[PDB]
Amino acid sequence: ASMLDMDDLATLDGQNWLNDQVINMYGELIMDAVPDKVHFFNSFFHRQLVTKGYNGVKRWTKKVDLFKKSLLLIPIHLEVHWSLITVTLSNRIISFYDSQGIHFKFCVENIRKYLLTEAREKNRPEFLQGWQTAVTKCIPQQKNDSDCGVFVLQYCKCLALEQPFQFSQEDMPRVRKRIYKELCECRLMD
Amino acid sequence: DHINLKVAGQDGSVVQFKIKRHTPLSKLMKAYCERQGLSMRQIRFRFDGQPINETDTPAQLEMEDEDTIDVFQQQTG
């Protein structure tokens, strides 16, 4: 983990839209803090897997045994929007979280194909079957049109540290400020 | 001790470079920007999905001959 330019940090400011440097850097912080349990794919992983297939992301897990982890977090970027896919390995459930009710199950199948492929190459027979889609659950939704990135990062923190979603729209200003300081310190300030 | 490196963009473009495995990659990143008209605060250089720092070398990133560097764009949402 490392430090961001001041203008990337500024995307947390006010009601500005989070960009990829904030998303990816906080992901780094999150798995810096629980590295045996969580693997965080960066926000470019999905586009690359979609426009260039398993051969375009093959080498990104060169140093990771995905299947020893408990939780994979995969931030999804949709034009103007941040969303989140999670893979819980213990029970082979792929989930899709979004703070504006958007349903994109069309892309969790790309993920499923990805996981079955990776399992084949990493000689992991216990993961060549069994993947489920998650039964959708009530998670905190946003009431403005700018906090999707902030919601996605807070879902990641909560899932990573195994906390409940104990937050709502009115906490977002404080969370933007917490994420900002955590980023300046390169550590999660629980 | 030169090495060949490809720099692949979101537009499908590909550009080749010779660089010594122990020079820092900042000269390739700045070369690639000037040549393509790109603003370097709007693009991101990544090798095997990992970010590349200005000071990083092909050697300490463990690159080999003809390896590929991907360039991505700012995302907001």
From Swiss-Prot, chain A:
Coiled coil: none annotated. Residues 3-159 are annotated as: Protease. It is found in: Nucleus, Nucleolus. It comes from the Eukaryota. The active site is at residues 81, 98, 148. Protease that catalyzes two essential functions in the SUMO pathway: processing of full-length SUMO3 to its mature form and deconjugation of SUMO2 and SUMO3 from targeted proteins. Has weak proteolytic activity against full-length SUMO1 or SUMO1 conjugates. Required for cell division. Interacts with CCAR2. Belongs to the peptidase C48 family. This is Sentrin-specific protease 5. It comes from Homo sapiens (Human). The gene is SENP5.
From Swiss-Prot, chain B:
Changing residue 20 to A: Impaired interaction with USP25. Cleavage of precursor form by SENP1, SENP2 or SENP5 is necessary for function. The keyword Nucleus applies. It is found in: Cytoplasm; Nucleus; Nucleus, PML body. Signal peptide: none annotated. Its main location: cytoplasm. Expressed predominantly in liver. Keywords: Cytoplasm, Isopeptide bond, Nucleus, Ubl conjugation, Ubl conjugation pathway. GO terms for biological process: negative regulation of DNA binding; protein sumoylation; regulation of protein localization to nucleus. Residues 1-77 form the Ubiquitin-like domain. GO terms for cellular component: cytoplasm; kinetochore; nucleoplasm; nucleus; PML body. It comes from the Eukaryota. One of its GO terms (molecular function) is protein tag activity. Covalently attached to a number of proteins. Interacts with BMAL1. Interacts with USP25 (via ts SIM domain); the interaction sumoylates USP25 and inhibits its ubiquitin hydrolyzing activity. Interacts with SAE2 and UBE2I. Ubiquitin-like protein which can be covalently attached to target lysines either as a monomer or as a lysine-linked polymer. Does not seem to be involved in protein degradation and may function as an antagonist of ubiquitin in the degradation process. Plays a role in a number of cellular processes such as nuclear transport, DNA replication and repair, mitosis and signal transduction. Covalent attachment to its substrates requires prior activation by the E1 complex SAE1-SAE2 and linkage to the E2 enzyme UBE2I, and can be promoted by an E3 ligase such as PIAS1-4, RANBP2 or CBX4. Belongs to the ubiquitin family. SUMO subfamily. This is Small ubiquitin-related modifier 3. The lineage of its organism: Eukaryota, Metazoa, Chordata, Craniata, Vertebrata. The chain holds residues 15 to 91 of 103 of the full protein.
